[PDB]
Design a protein around this nucleic acid. Structure first.
Length: 188
RNA sequence: AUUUCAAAGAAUCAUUCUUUUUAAAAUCCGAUUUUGUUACUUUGAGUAAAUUAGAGUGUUCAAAGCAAACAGUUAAAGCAU
Protein backbone atom coordinates (compact mmCIF):
# COMPACT_ATOMS: atom_id res chain seq x y z
CA UNK A 1 0.00 0.00 0.00
CA UNK A 2 1.28 3.51 0.99
CA UNK A 3 4.61 2.37 2.51
CA UNK A 4 5.95 0.39 -0.50
CA UNK A 5 5.07 3.26 -2.84
CA UNK A 6 6.88 5.98 -0.81
CA UNK A 7 9.85 4.04 0.64
CA UNK A 8 11.95 1.74 -1.59
CA UNK A 9 13.35 -0.44 1.30
CA UNK A 10 11.73 -2.47 4.14
CA UNK A 11 9.94 0.19 6.27
CA UNK A 12 9.99 1.07 9.99
CA UNK A 13 7.08 2.66 11.94
CA UNK A 14 7.96 6.32 11.34
CA UNK A 15 8.88 5.59 7.71
CA UNK A 16 5.38 4.09 7.32
CA UNK A 17 3.81 7.14 9.08
CA UNK A 18 5.67 9.45 6.65
CA UNK A 19 4.52 7.32 3.72
CA UNK A 20 0.90 7.45 4.95
CA UNK A 21 1.11 11.21 5.57
CA UNK A 22 2.78 11.89 2.21
CA UNK A 23 0.16 9.81 0.34
CA UNK A 24 -2.64 11.57 2.28
CA UNK A 25 -1.14 14.99 1.34
CA UNK A 26 -0.91 13.93 -2.34
CA UNK A 27 -4.43 12.43 -2.32
CA UNK A 28 -6.02 15.44 -0.53
CA UNK A 29 -3.79 17.95 -2.34
CA UNK A 30 -2.53 21.24 -0.87
CA UNK A 31 -3.86 23.79 -3.34
CA UNK A 32 -0.84 26.01 -4.14
CA UNK A 33 1.57 23.01 -4.42
CA UNK A 34 -0.81 20.64 -6.35
CA UNK A 35 0.82 17.43 -7.70
CA UNK A 36 2.27 17.55 -4.22
CA UNK A 37 4.57 14.53 -3.92
CA UNK A 38 3.97 12.18 -6.90
CA UNK A 39 7.61 12.18 -8.07
CA UNK A 40 8.96 11.62 -4.49
CA UNK A 41 10.75 8.44 -3.39
CA UNK A 42 12.41 8.20 0.04
CA UNK A 43 15.65 6.52 1.09
CA UNK A 44 15.19 6.56 4.87
CA UNK A 45 13.63 8.44 7.82
CA UNK A 46 15.14 9.03 11.28
CA UNK A 47 13.80 10.30 14.61
CA UNK A 48 15.79 12.71 16.78
CA UNK A 49 14.75 14.23 20.11
CA UNK A 50 16.00 17.55 21.52
CA UNK A 51 17.49 17.71 25.04
CA UNK A 52 15.06 20.57 25.86
CA UNK A 53 12.17 18.16 24.95
CA UNK A 54 10.16 20.57 22.80
CA UNK A 55 8.58 17.72 20.79
CA UNK A 56 10.69 15.64 18.33
CA UNK A 57 12.35 16.26 14.94
CA UNK A 58 12.27 13.91 11.91
CA UNK A 59 15.14 13.71 9.43
CA UNK A 60 14.13 12.40 5.98
CA UNK A 61 16.67 11.25 3.38
CA UNK A 62 15.80 11.83 -0.27
CA UNK A 63 17.82 11.01 -3.47
CA UNK A 64 19.74 14.17 -4.62
CA UNK A 65 18.06 14.07 -8.08
CA UNK A 66 14.49 13.90 -6.60
CA UNK A 67 15.40 16.41 -3.88
CA UNK A 68 16.87 18.99 -6.29
CA UNK A 69 14.21 18.60 -8.96
CA UNK A 70 11.06 18.39 -6.83
CA UNK A 71 11.69 19.02 -3.13
CA UNK A 72 13.88 22.15 -3.31
CA UNK A 73 11.36 24.03 -5.50
CA UNK A 74 8.44 23.76 -3.00
CA UNK A 75 10.41 23.07 0.19
CA UNK A 76 9.20 25.68 2.73
CA UNK A 77 5.55 25.06 1.86
CA UNK A 78 6.16 21.29 1.66
CA UNK A 79 7.79 21.09 5.12
CA UNK A 80 5.07 23.31 6.62
CA UNK A 81 2.43 20.91 5.18
CA UNK A 82 4.31 17.84 6.55
CA UNK A 83 4.61 19.61 9.96
CA UNK A 84 0.87 20.44 9.89
CA UNK A 85 0.06 16.77 9.08
CA UNK A 86 2.41 15.23 11.73
CA UNK A 87 3.42 17.67 14.46
CA UNK A 88 7.04 16.51 14.90
CA UNK A 89 9.53 18.95 13.27
CA UNK A 90 10.50 17.75 9.79
CA UNK A 91 13.76 18.21 7.89
CA UNK A 92 14.21 17.01 4.29
CA UNK A 93 17.81 16.35 3.17
CA UNK A 94 19.53 15.08 0.03
CA UNK A 95 21.75 12.03 0.40
CA UNK A 96 25.14 12.94 -1.09
CA UNK A 97 28.12 10.69 -1.77
CA UNK A 98 31.36 11.98 -0.24
CA UNK A 99 34.45 10.88 -2.15
CA UNK A 100 38.08 10.22 -1.25
CA UNK A 101 39.88 10.79 -4.59
CA UNK A 102 42.91 8.88 -3.29
CA UNK A 103 41.17 5.57 -4.12
CA UNK A 104 40.66 6.39 -7.86
CA UNK A 105 37.09 5.00 -8.25
CA UNK A 106 36.04 3.91 -11.77
CA UNK A 107 33.13 6.30 -12.37
CA UNK A 108 35.07 9.54 -11.67
CA UNK A 109 38.02 11.19 -13.28
CA UNK A 110 39.80 13.61 -10.83
CA UNK A 111 37.98 14.97 -7.71
CA UNK A 112 34.46 16.42 -8.09
CA UNK A 113 33.93 19.60 -6.03
CA UNK A 114 30.34 18.51 -5.28
CA UNK A 115 31.65 15.31 -3.60
CA UNK A 116 34.27 17.01 -1.31
CA UNK A 117 33.86 16.51 2.49
CA UNK A 118 33.74 20.29 2.98
CA UNK A 119 31.32 20.96 0.08
CA UNK A 120 28.93 18.19 1.21
CA UNK A 121 29.00 19.35 4.86
CA UNK A 122 28.31 22.97 3.84
CA UNK A 123 25.54 21.62 1.54
CA UNK A 124 23.97 19.65 4.44
CA UNK A 125 24.07 22.89 6.48
CA UNK A 126 22.21 24.49 3.54
CA UNK A 127 19.68 21.57 3.42
CA UNK A 128 18.73 21.80 7.13
CA UNK A 129 18.02 25.56 7.04
CA UNK A 130 16.67 25.34 3.40
CA UNK A 131 13.12 26.91 3.93
CA UNK A 132 15.19 29.78 5.40
CA UNK A 133 18.37 31.28 3.96
CA UNK A 134 21.86 32.03 5.39
CA UNK A 135 23.01 35.68 5.72
CA UNK A 136 26.45 34.70 7.00
CA UNK A 137 28.58 31.98 8.56
CA UNK A 138 31.22 32.47 11.25
CA UNK A 139 33.34 29.80 12.94
CA UNK A 140 34.32 30.43 16.59
CA UNK A 141 37.27 28.43 17.97
CA UNK A 142 36.68 28.17 21.73
CA UNK A 143 39.54 27.56 24.23
CA UNK A 144 38.68 23.83 24.53
CA UNK A 145 39.58 23.51 20.78
CA UNK A 146 35.95 22.98 19.83
CA UNK A 147 34.75 24.89 16.76
CA UNK A 148 31.26 26.36 16.59
CA UNK A 149 29.36 27.28 13.43
CA UNK A 150 27.50 30.58 14.03
CA UNK A 151 24.86 30.78 11.32
CA UNK A 152 23.01 34.04 10.73
CA UNK A 153 19.52 33.74 9.16
CA UNK A 154 17.37 36.49 7.58
CA UNK A 155 14.78 38.73 9.31
CA UNK A 156 11.62 37.30 7.67
CA UNK A 157 11.40 34.40 10.15
CA UNK A 158 10.51 36.71 13.07
CA UNK A 159 6.90 36.08 11.96
CA UNK A 160 7.31 32.32 12.68
CA UNK A 161 6.58 31.28 16.31
CA UNK A 162 8.37 27.94 15.73
CA UNK A 163 11.70 29.80 15.13
CA UNK A 164 13.67 28.86 18.32
CA UNK A 165 12.51 25.21 18.31
CA UNK A 166 13.61 24.95 14.66
CA UNK A 167 17.01 26.60 15.46
CA UNK A 168 17.69 24.11 18.31
CA UNK A 169 16.47 21.35 15.93
CA UNK A 170 18.93 22.49 13.18
CA UNK A 171 21.76 22.46 15.73
CA UNK A 172 20.73 18.99 17.01
CA UNK A 173 20.24 17.52 13.49
CA UNK A 174 23.62 18.76 12.24
CA UNK A 175 25.27 17.50 15.47
CA UNK A 176 23.76 14.03 14.94
CA UNK A 177 24.83 13.93 11.24
CA UNK A 178 28.44 14.94 11.99
CA UNK A 179 30.30 16.10 15.08
CA UNK A 180 29.98 19.84 14.42
CA UNK A 181 28.21 22.17 16.86
CA UNK A 182 26.15 25.02 15.41
CA UNK A 183 24.56 28.08 16.96
CA UNK A 184 22.08 30.37 15.22
CA UNK A 185 21.06 34.04 15.25
CA UNK A 186 19.35 36.71 13.13
CA UNK A 187 19.34 40.60 13.18
CA UNK A 188 18.01 42.44 16.33
C1' A B 1 43.24 31.26 -1.28
C1' U B 2 41.09 26.24 -2.66
C1' U B 3 39.96 20.32 -1.74
C1' U B 4 38.67 14.54 4.67
C1' C B 5 36.76 18.01 9.03
C1' A B 6 36.54 15.08 13.24
C1' A B 7 34.50 12.02 17.33
C1' A B 8 34.85 8.67 21.41
C1' G B 9 37.69 5.26 24.52
C1' A B 10 42.12 3.51 27.22
C1' A B 11 46.88 4.59 29.34
C1' U B 12 49.16 8.96 32.17
C1' C B 13 50.17 14.71 35.15
C1' A B 14 41.34 19.50 32.80
C1' U B 15 48.27 17.97 30.83
C1' U B 16 50.60 14.04 28.24
C1' C B 17 51.33 9.26 25.33
C1' U B 18 48.13 5.68 22.83
C1' U B 19 43.74 2.83 20.50
C1' U B 20 39.16 2.46 18.19
C1' U B 21 35.06 4.49 14.15
C1' U B 22 33.63 7.93 10.23
C1' A B 23 32.54 7.77 2.37
C1' A B 24 33.48 4.74 -2.18
C1' A B 25 35.56 1.25 -5.44
C1' A B 26 38.33 -3.39 -6.35
C1' U B 27 38.89 -8.75 -3.91
C1' C B 28 38.24 -13.13 -1.06
C1' C B 29 35.08 -16.62 2.51
C1' G B 30 26.66 -11.10 5.76
C1' A B 31 31.98 -10.78 6.82
C1' U B 32 36.95 -10.89 5.70
C1' U B 33 42.20 -7.02 2.85
C1' U B 34 43.91 -3.21 -0.90
C1' U B 35 43.76 2.16 -3.60
C1' G B 36 48.12 8.78 -7.36
C1' U B 37 54.42 9.98 -8.64
C1' U B 38 58.48 13.17 -6.92
C1' A B 39 60.83 16.84 -3.33
C1' C B 40 61.11 16.60 1.93
C1' U B 41 61.39 13.14 6.17
C1' U B 42 61.92 8.42 9.01
C1' U B 43 64.14 4.02 10.00
C1' G B 44 67.62 0.74 7.74
C1' A B 45 71.15 -2.20 4.71
C1' G B 46 76.54 -2.10 3.08
C1' U B 47 80.54 0.74 5.66
C1' A B 48 89.15 -0.54 5.81
C1' A B 49 92.37 0.76 9.58
C1' A B 50 95.51 4.75 11.37
C1' U B 51 93.55 9.16 12.94
C1' U B 52 89.20 11.49 15.73
C1' A B 53 85.49 11.14 19.64
C1' G B 54 85.21 7.57 23.32
C1' A B 55 85.16 2.86 27.13
C1' G B 56 88.49 -0.89 29.39
C1' U B 57 93.35 -0.91 31.31
C1' G B 58 98.34 2.74 37.92
C1' U B 59 103.48 2.92 31.22
C1' U B 60 106.75 4.13 38.30
C1' C B 61 102.65 8.96 36.76
C1' A B 62 102.52 11.53 32.18
C1' A B 63 103.22 11.67 26.52
C1' A B 64 102.12 6.53 25.86
C1' G B 65 101.01 1.33 24.72
C1' C B 66 97.16 -2.71 23.84
C1' A B 67 97.79 -4.78 27.26
C1' A B 68 96.93 -7.05 31.71
C1' A B 69 95.06 -8.85 36.39
C1' C B 70 94.73 -13.02 40.09
C1' A B 71 96.38 -17.01 43.71
C1' G B 72 100.79 -20.17 45.10
C1' U B 73 108.46 -19.98 50.41
C1' U B 74 109.14 -24.13 45.54
C1' A B 75 99.70 -25.22 46.69
C1' A B 76 95.03 -25.61 47.03
C1' A B 77 91.06 -25.00 43.81
C1' G B 78 89.13 -26.36 39.22
C1' C B 79 88.70 -31.48 35.47
C1' A B 80 91.12 -36.07 33.96
C1' U B 81 91.58 -41.58 35.00
Amino acid sequence: AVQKRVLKSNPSDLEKEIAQCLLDIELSSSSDIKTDAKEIKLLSCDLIEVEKLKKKTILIYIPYKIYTTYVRKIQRKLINELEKKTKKYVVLVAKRTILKGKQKNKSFKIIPRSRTLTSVYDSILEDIVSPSEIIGKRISMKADGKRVFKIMLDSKERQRDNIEEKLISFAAVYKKITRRDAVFSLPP
